[PDB]
Ligand binder design. Structure first.
Ligand SMILES: [N+]
Ligand SMILES: [N+]
Lengths: 283, 283
């Protein structure tokens, strides 16, 4: 019967050579599973959440990446709009410049209103065109009687060499009328027989500083709201890309190892089992 | 007979007391008639003439005084005219100033002439009025086709905001026409319905720098001819007023005495006569 008793003994060593080498691997495993556990606590500490599983890690990260891309399009979109205003404003600001002061004085002299002020109200898209339109008549003074001037007309001496005057109701003024051919960024009026004026569209037109200055305020409001939202976004992004890179380090290095049962658990268990085997080889 | 012989003797002393005192006066006379003769030679030396008589002195002086007054009205009249030119010139010179250079460039661009040059020819009395007249159309460019511009019209960018153009023959240009009311040192055009322009007469009008610059030359010519004649006159006057005062000194002091027969002539004559008397009182 020697065969059952001898072969039986083999199988116990056979196993013990397995438990021995099996344990040895768990020992290489430990130090790495240590570093792995550190990184996992740390990264899981960076945000209030609990990672029981590796799938949790992948889930928190799907969300992390949307937070990121969305924040990057908004911060980019905002700053785009911000710069579109930094620019806008710049344009409406440079002033030409300079209308004559004397005119203000004469319009005050004769009861009545300036035209720079009557049409100070006009729109931004229209303002440049209408300035070219009235030719040198832009700074005309509007007075309904034209009687005050005729009297004080002789008196005036220092007035600008050409003075333009128009009889109308400043409160409800009735637009002029021209023989005109509109050209790109310019206008061509037939002022008379065989005579024509070409006036370019100005940057900073006489007419419409009031609707203009008014837009320029609205742009400052918006700009400061943008720079405020931009600040919040760009921080938000930096913080997110910082947790992005957080996950990568961990993913590339410690992710496989973690979510394993501690090595020591099986190392001590296998050991009491190998001691049990050795005792049976002893008995 | 004692009476004839004694009384006869008296009359000889009687006379000798006359010759004695008569001679004494001639002696006071001499030194003064000396100084008188010096001044007469001297003054008669100052100008090539001969004074045989006191009437000669009065005659040369009538002439001297006309030379003087006439020279003083001419020198005064000349300098009056000179200063009327120093002034004139000053006025035509101060330049306003300044017409746009770009215009020159554009008129060269389109075959054709400027209006500042078409009317550069006008008169001085008319120039200021016509400048006020054309309003801002003074610097218009005259071109007969108006075709070159329409093509290059779009291209133009930097041109002054208002550009004025007129189709005519620069060589034989046909004046514009306005609805105008002429005012003192100003003009009032009805440019349109319910619209009027007031342009003051300029000092230094755009039109007529060519008839102006041309007058200004003629004034420099004349001015230098005046300052030349003025120089000759004013010297001539100084020299004359110097001979005027020459005559006065002499007139006030030595004129009575001169034109007398030398004292010594009668002093020696009377003396041989008083010696003859004394010899008869002796005999
Ligand atoms: N328009
Ligand atoms: N005139």
């Amino acid at each position: 019967s020697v065969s059952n008793a001898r072969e039986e003994r083999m199988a116990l060593r056979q196993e013990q050579e397995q438990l021995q080498s099996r344990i040895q691997s768990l020992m290489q495993r430990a130090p790495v599973w240590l570093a792995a556990q550190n990184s996992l606590n740390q990264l899981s500490e960076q945000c209030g959440e609990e990672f029981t599983s590796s799938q949790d890690v992948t889930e928190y990260l799907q969300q992390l990446l949307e937070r990121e891309r969305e924040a990057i399009v908004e911060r980019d979109e905002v700053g785009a709009r911000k710069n579109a205003v930094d620019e806008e404003i710049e344009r409406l600001s440079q002033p030409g410049g300079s209308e004559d002061q004397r005119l203000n004085a004469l319009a005050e002299r004769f009861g009545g209103v300036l035209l720079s002020e009557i049409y100070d109200d006009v729109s931004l898209e229209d303002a440049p065109y209408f300035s070219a339109l009235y030719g040198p008549s832009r700074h005309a003074i509007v007075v309904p009687d034209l009687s005050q001037v005729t009297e004080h007309l002789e008196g005036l001496t220092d007035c600008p060499e050409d003075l333009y005057l128009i009889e109308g109701d400043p409160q409800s003024f009735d637009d002029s009328v021209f023989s005109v051919d509109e050209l790109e960024k310019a206008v061509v009026v037939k002022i008379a027989d065989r005579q024509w004026r070409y006036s370019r569209f100005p940057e900073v037109p006489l007419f419409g500083r009031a609707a203009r200055e008014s837009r320029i305020e609205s742009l400052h409001a918006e700009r400061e709201v943008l720079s405020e939202r931009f600040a919040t976004l760009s921080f938000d992004v930096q913080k997110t890309q910082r947790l992005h890179q957080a996950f990568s380090r961990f993913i590339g290095s410690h992710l496989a190892v973690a979510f394993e049962s501690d090595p020591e658990a099986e190392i001590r268990q296998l050991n009491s089992r190998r001691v049990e085997l050795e005792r049976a080889l002893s008995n």
